[PDB]
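batch job 7 of whatever, protein = myohemerythrin
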Amino acid sequence: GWEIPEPYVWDESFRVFYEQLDEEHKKIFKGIFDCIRDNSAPNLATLVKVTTNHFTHEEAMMDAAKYSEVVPHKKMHKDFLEKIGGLSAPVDAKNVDYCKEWLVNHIKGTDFKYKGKL
Ligand SMILES: [Cl-]
Ligand SMILES: [Cl-]
């Protein structure tokens, strides 16, 4: 899989060139970064909030564009929200690692497929 940033921050290799989606990706990196350093019930819920908002938006753009790989992508999103929606603070190290991995892998292995398509 792709390199997990340490510190856990977005960098330009994750860019999709759709400004609001890129800004959304930057806030999910920051949401996980904050849960790592302050593994609190508010930060977990903020993470769930910013990830649900991003997924609704990215799906709206894929549907508007009639992007034909939207259906497996939506399933990826649904499963992730179900997993982080089911967590409670403090999130254990396995699940923090899962989240760090999932974001990196999701943007470069799946969100990258819509580059120039939305
Ligand atoms: Cl890379
Ligand atoms: Cl095209």
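notes: Residues 2, 13 surround chloride ion (ligand 1) (CB under 6 Å).
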